[PDB]
Amino acid sequence: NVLTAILLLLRELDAEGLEAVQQTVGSRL
Amino acid sequence: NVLTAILLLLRELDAEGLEAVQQTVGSRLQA
Amino acid sequence: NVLTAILLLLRELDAEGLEAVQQTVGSRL
Amino acid sequence: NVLTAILLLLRELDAEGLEAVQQTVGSRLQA
Ligand SMILES: [Cl-]
Ligand SMILES: [Cl-]
Ligand SMILES: [Cl-]
Ligand SMILES: [Cl-]
């Protein structure tokens, strides 16, 4: 359920927030 | 706010979920 | 982490969304 | 949207988390 919630929430973000997410995700992978 | 919630939820994801977020965000950023 | 995220997200909601949350939570308790 | 995400996340909470959401929403609704 957490993945679905995150993906739904991503479209409240603009470019700067998406870059923050991408950097956190990359550091975790 | 929404960003802070997302970053906290990322700590709960497994590898496959992280890869799906990576692919989705990359598609949003590149277009 | 899920509780904190939910509580943070609640202030994006107005009265109608809060009532939806309260009804779902009550049915779960 | 945010509402749909919240309702999905509620399925992941334990009893104590549900009670904390109940108390927070009730305080927001009553004021
Ligand atoms: Cl998940
Ligand atoms: Cl999106
Ligand atoms: Cl939690
Ligand atoms: Cl609130």
Author numbering:
A (entry chain B), C (entry chain B): 214 to 242
B (entry chain A), D (entry chain A): 214 to 244
Recite the paper's sentences.
Cilia and flagella-associated protein 410 (CFAP410) localizes at the basal body of cilia/flagella and plays essential roles in ciliogenesis, neuronal development and DNA damage repair. CFAP410 is a bimodular protein comprising two folded domains, i.e. NTD and CTD, which are connected through a variable unstructured loop. All these three crystal structures show a similar homotetrameric arrangement, with each monomer consisting of two α helices that form an open nutcracker-like conformation. Two CTDs first form an intercalated homodimer, and two such dimers further assemble into a tetramer by packing head-to-head through their first helices.
Homo sapiens CFAP410 (HsCFAP410) consists of 255 amino acids. The CTD truncations that finally generated well-diffracting crystals were fragments covering residues 256–295, 212–246 and 213–246 of H. sapiens, T. brucei and C. reinhardtii CFAP410 proteins, respectively. All HsCFAP410-CTD fragments were soluble in a buffer containing 20 mM HEPES (pH 7.5), 100 mM NaCl, and 1 mM DTT. The crystallizing condition for HsCFAP410-CTD contained 1.5 M NaCl and 10% (v/v) ethanol (22°C). Those of HsCFAP410-CTD and CrCFAP410-CTD were determined subsequently by molecular replacement using the crystal structure of TbCFAP410-CTD as a search template. One of the mutations, L224P, is located in the C-terminal domain (CTD) of human CFAP410 and causes severe spondylometaphyseal dysplasia, axial (SMDAX). Our results showed that for HsCFAP410-CTD both the wild-type and mutant A219E adopted the same conformation. However, the disease-causing mutant L224P lost all characteristic helical features and became completely unfolded. Our conformational analyses of the simulation data showed that while the wild-type model of HsCFAP410-CTD agreed very well with the crystal structure (all-atom RMSD = 0.8 Å), the simulated model of L224P was drastically different from the wild-type crystal structure, with the associated all-atom RMSD of 4.4 Å. The single-residue mutation L224P in HsCFAP410 that causes the autosomal recessive ciliopathy SMDAX may be attributed to the disrupted oligomeric assembly that causes the mislocalization of the protein possibly by abolishing its interaction with a partner protein at the basal body.
